Swiss-Prot record, chains A, B:
Stated name of the protein: 3C-like proteinase nsp5
Catalytic activity of the protein: TSAVLQ-|-SGFRK-NH2 and SGVTFQ-|-GKFKK the two peptides corresponding to the two self-cleavage sites of the SARS 3C-like proteinase are the two most reactive peptide substrates. The enzyme exhibits a strong preference for substrates containing Gln at P1 position and Leu at P2 position
Subcellular location: Host cytoplasm; Host Golgi apparatus; Host nucleus
Covalent cross-link Glycyl lysine isopeptide (Lys-Gly) (interchain with G-Cter in ubiquitin), where: 5, 90
Amino acid sequence: SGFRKMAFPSGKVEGCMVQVTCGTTTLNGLWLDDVVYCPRHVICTSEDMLNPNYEDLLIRKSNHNFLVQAGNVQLRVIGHSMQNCVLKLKVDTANPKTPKYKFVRIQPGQTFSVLACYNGSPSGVYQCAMRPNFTIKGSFLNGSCGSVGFNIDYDCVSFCYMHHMELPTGVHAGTDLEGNFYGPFVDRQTAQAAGTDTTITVNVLAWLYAAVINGDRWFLNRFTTTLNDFNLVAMKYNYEPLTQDHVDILGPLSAQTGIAVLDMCASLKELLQNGMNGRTILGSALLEDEFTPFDVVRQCSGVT
Amino acid sequence: SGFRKMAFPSGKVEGCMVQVTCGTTTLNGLWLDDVVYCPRHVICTSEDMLNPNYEDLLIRKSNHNFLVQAGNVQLRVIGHSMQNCVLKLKVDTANPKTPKYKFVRIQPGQTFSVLACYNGSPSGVYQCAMRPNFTIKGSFLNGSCGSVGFNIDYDCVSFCYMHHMELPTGVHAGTDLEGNFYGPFVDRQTAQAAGTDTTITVNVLAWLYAAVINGDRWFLNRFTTTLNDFNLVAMKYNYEPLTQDHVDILGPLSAQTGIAVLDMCASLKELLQNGMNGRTILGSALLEDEFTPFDVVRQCSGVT
Ligand SMILES: Cc1ccncc1NC(=O)Cc1cncc(C#N)c1
Ligand SMILES: Cc1ccncc1NC(=O)Cc1cncc(C#N)c1
């Protein structure tokens, strides 16, 4: 009973957080095995950030310039290398708290938990979605760079995001763990356009199924629709086009509730065209798109 | 930039979760030092739950009937005792992962993180408020009993809640770590009235300050009010009466933003009487009451 914006337990990730300092800049690093991963802009001063030449800036640095501290233990840096926008610092000690892990590049619309950190210390954990425009609407202040996003399948942590930047609009941008930015962003203090965003349609439908499962059913109606008709409404309201792949992933929820996907699409169509009429769904007065169908199944079945 | 419903990092609590089985009932326990804490209804069968005599049911049980398993390690039970609605199982081994901790009874309106667990395994973490009527609107399924709520001040975990029950209405009830229920609830399978709930006024005002800090300011107006006038509006909309103690706790946010508390109360008054007019505040289409003034300061300053 109940449905919350649940994050993964952050314990396995907490054991990986370290502080990385280079010159006068300090941010967060991720220590897995004998490598520490962090944003390459750790090597920049504020003046460098306007237009950095990272290859030139990294040439001035030596292994001993990167100060890595895990709690109180200082790590010895024996190698450094830049891969895209991340720095990989080889340390002489493998992290004893390294969980089973993978590096994955998530798709837009997918969700993950963020462990917000400052000076290598965890401050909070929250769940969020990678927007269709490759930005994340997080909660990050100066010092949070290097904080990571992840998903967990039983004992395996799939790291999918490392925080790098706050755009002038207050939204966030970052990379996968190979340092490739999600979206068109560059690690530079320059105004940068984030594309037109849309609402994650399959996630909204998944959340409508979670609402039915939890007893919120006032929005179910006597109507149905087609993928074509629904998609004309989705286009009008800046929703992602629904495909048969999305319908296929909604199958378990359709089967559990007995509500065909296109019937749920007709409920969503009516909510888009008429609003919520001052009513709420799972404690929200708007249509929630930060729960994937997988998240809804996991939370509604109690997967650990 | 940004403002999220952030939970505490759950790592220190994950290291305390164990599975407790007694007969055919299995639920979660909290292992701190050489004691395992769990709901006393672990000793009940489904038939006992209709009207349990816990003292009689516990008399039939011996130390060897309580199966406690931490991951794969089995703990040896050398004592058992009931304190209010919790069972305290003395084990022969102190939990090596016991963090610095306290047991605290929180006040209604205060917030905390819940680490939802099943079979002694963490599944997710979320932030919630203890409602003024002493219920929590969580996300809990069968097997989640014994999952705990907590707050963390640097290295100290203050455990404040243990989950016991889902009311017929889908809302949740539980105890402090001494087994005393929050609210009028009893650990019995009987319909039980949760009082009239109200919205946590000081938390809504705190969240309005967080909105101003993050750039959402469309709701600020040219008006002010008095505590008396505001409280007449609060009574009309089922909001908690605002006191000078609440105004006092909002002082840091008033100082940071330069918006006097009573001026923010006038903005809240106008939003209550007129609604949001299809607009949003920090990504919400309703007035959020699950952030205390302390949470807003902590999140807006990056406390670890
Ligand atoms: C103040 C703050 C808050 C949250 N997240 C991030 C920040 N600050 C920054 O973005 C600093 C920065 C500047 N220019 C480019 C990059 C990159 N890549 C990073
Ligand atoms: C099914 C479920 C889901 C979430 N939380 C809890 C439950 N189930 C229960 O409450 C089981 C129970 C029954 N009667 C009294 C108590 C107490 N105290 C507990």
